[model samples]
Target: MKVVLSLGGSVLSNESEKIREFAKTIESVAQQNQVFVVVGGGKLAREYIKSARELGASETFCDYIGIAATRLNAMLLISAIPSAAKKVPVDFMEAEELSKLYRVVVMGGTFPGHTTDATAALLAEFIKADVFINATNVDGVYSADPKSDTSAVKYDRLSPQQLVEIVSRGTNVVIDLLAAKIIERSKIKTYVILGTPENIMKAVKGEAVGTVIA
Candidate 1:
């Protein structure tokens, strides 16, 4: 099956050991299925973005810094996965093409001010992925702000409209609006699972693990 996976930066750590373990799982998965992995910058990029602010930086330029961090992370991932394309793709076009030549492809941010979530969704739609595993920081979707509302509840599966609604009402769902709408229009089968590499495999293979923003 064709697969597009979004690896949240916040979910990843500085420890190379964890990344190496994740790569082991990805390499195993790629043995059978085609995979495109979109990486986020997380802590590495965030601190740089903050520091650049003092250097008279524009948000757009700061966005570029963050993008660089993401690609840097992407590089680490590809290094760990031997089957992945040696070079990280700069944009979705390159990524789509790389998928044709390799079993696994890794890439990072694209245009400025673009959320990683939106970028991943665009690639998932572009490649017509059979399954999209969004490895986010959260376990699943929540109907209300989990921080403030004690009555909030997690969802097992959410319709596309509900996915939009949750964020539309300012519930602080982890997904961005553009990403949500892209999935709605593309009609892509998506699994918004916990960010563990194993859980990504579980959701990809068959086990029910997290919310499916279908």
Candidate 2:
């Protein structure tokens, strides 16, 4: 199966071992299935974005800094996965082209306003991937911010429209509005789950591991 994994910056740990494990899992999966990955900047991009905003920099430049941070993360993930493309592709077309030559293709941000999740969603749509797995910090979608609201409830399954409704509440960032809309239009099978190497494997194997959006 062709797959796209959206690695959340929030879930990415600083430990090299964790990154190594993720790479190992993806490489193993790539042996039988096509895999493309997009890594977020996590705290690195957030810190730089905040600094740029505080210094009165243009929002566009701040977005560029965020993109650079994501690319830096892309480079880090690529370093751990020998089979991945050496250079990060700037767009979905380039990433698809790279997939022809490599089992695992990796990339970062594309445009300023679009988040890494959005980038991954578009890539999944562009490539018509069998599944789009958003390996996020949150385990699933909730009616409220799970951490902040005691009444928050997690769902095992949801439609893309339902996911978009949750996004409208700004309850969680596991999947953003733009990404949700894309999935809604493309009818992409999606899994939004905790970003663990093991859980990712479960999602890829078609197990009910997290909130399923279809």
Top TM-score prediction, candidate number: 2
Candidate 2: stretches off by over 4 Å: 170-172
Q: Give candidate 2's error at residue 42 in angstroms.
A: 0.8
Candidate 1 runs further than 4 Å off = 170-173
Report the Cα lDDT for residue 122, model 2.
90
> What does the lDDT come to for candidate 2?
0.88
Q: Give the candidate number with the greatest lDDT.
A: 2
In the range 1-214, model 1's lDDT, one tens digit per residue, is 8888888867775678889988988888899899888889888898899899988899889999999999999898888999999988988888888888999999989987767778888998988988888888877777665644677767888888888887675333477788889988888888887788789889879567788866
Candidate 1: Cα lDDT at 72: 93
| Candidate lDDT (C-alpha), each | 0.84, 0.88
RMSD of each: 1.8, 1.6
What TM-score fits each model?
0.94, 0.95
Question: How far off is residue 83 in model 2, in Å?
Answer: 1.0
Model 1: how far residue 92 lies from native, Å: 1.4
Local accuracy of candidate 2 as per-residue lDDT tens digits, 101-134: 9999999899888797788899899999999999
lDDT of 1 at 179: 89
**What's the true lDDT of residue 145 in model 2?**
52
